[PDB]
Ligand binder design. Structure first.
Ligand SMILES: CCCCCCO[C@@H]1O[C@H](CO)[C@H](O)[C@H](N)[C@H]1O[C@@H]1O[C@@H](C)[C@@H](O)[C@@H](O)[C@@H]1O
Ligand SMILES: [Hg+2]
Ligand SMILES: [Hg+2]
Ligand SMILES: [Hg+2]
Ligand SMILES: [Hg+2]
Length: 263
């Protein structure tokens, strides 16, 4: 809304692509976020001017409460640093949640296991798994009305290979000739409104399947892929945002491993 201040930085080169080894924009013109595609300084400016508040949700149940400490600490070093952050930890063990020191402007809410709440406390919801750790920068370059992340195991495969729900009896069914990408169920987000619409669409889809006595091959992840097929995300994060180094190594194509799994 408000204008940006004087800024000095490398002039974008029209005849010089940033990256030439990967697709940096989808067929529906949504950027695909890769290191080297964005100037964080510009993006930080734009989002700070709007005093943007990002909500980060995680569900730590049972033995998973153990990953909270590493998760929160690493997030404190790489997640939306400089912006307002609100962590929402949904757990079945409120007292097991570790006491993590948070930077200023960042807070944490423990929810023992409504929506209207999210609409008033944050501008964006980022939803991920807890058994993870941040290893590098994960910032506002990902914020958009709706985004999904490319699965680290199929980002170089053809649709026919994707592990979509192939049974026509499931609401998550996707034929072999349909599909843009295979998105990860453990890293998606967008505005509060768009994220609730997605989760509401999936919950209903999952009920219909249960009533029909069937469960999608990859559960939640199967429905997400179906919803994102019909509602193209406004931004797609590259595999840099969710990788398993132990299981997949470190390809030259990935200049950074931002969010990874904890062996
Ligand atoms: C992250 C490694 C990618 C390649 C392994 C296959 O990944 C699995 O893919 C299915 C869908 O086809 C599900 O998404 C599984 N959850 C994926 O497992 C992955 O690997 C295991 C070991 C865990 O790290 C899991 O979190 C990963 O998604
Ligand atoms: Hg969420
Ligand atoms: Hg869905
Ligand atoms: Hg769901
Ligand atoms: Hg979902």
């Amino acid at each position: 809304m408000v204008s940006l201040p004087r800024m000095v930085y490398p002039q974008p080169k029209v005849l010089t692509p940033c990256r030439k080894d990967v697709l940096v924009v989808t067929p529906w013109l949504a950027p695909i976020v890769w290191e080297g595609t964005f100037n964080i300084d510009i993006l930080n400016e734009q989002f700070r001017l709007q005093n943007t508040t990002i909500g980060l949700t995680v569900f730590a149940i049972k033995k998973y409460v153990a990953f909270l400490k590493l998760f929160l600490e690493t997030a404190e070093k790489h997640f939306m640093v400089g912006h307002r952050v609100h962590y929402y930890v949904f757990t079945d063990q409120p007292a097991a949640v570790p006491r993590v020191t948070l930077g200023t402007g960042r807070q944490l809410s423990v929810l023992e296991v409504c929506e209207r709440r999210f609409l008033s406390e944050v501008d964006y919801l980022v939803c991920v798994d807890v058994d993870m750790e941040f290893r590098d920068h994960v910032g506002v370059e990902i914020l958009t009305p709706l985004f999904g992340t490319l699965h680290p195991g199929f980002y170089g495969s053809s649709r026919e290979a994707f592990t979509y729900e192939r049974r026509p009896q499931s609401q998550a069914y996707i034929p072999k000739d349909e599909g843009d990408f295979y998105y990860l169920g453990g890293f998606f987000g967008g505005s509060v409104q768009e994220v609730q619409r997605l989760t509401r669409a999936c919950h209903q889809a999952m009920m219909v399947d249960q009533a029909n006595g069937i469960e999608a091959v990859w559960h939640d992840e199967s429905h997400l892929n179906k919803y994102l097929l019909r509602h193209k995300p406004t931004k797609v994060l590259s595999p840099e945002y969710l990788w398993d180094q132990q299981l997949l190594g470190w390809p030259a194509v990935l200049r950074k491993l931002r969010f990874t799994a904890v062996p």
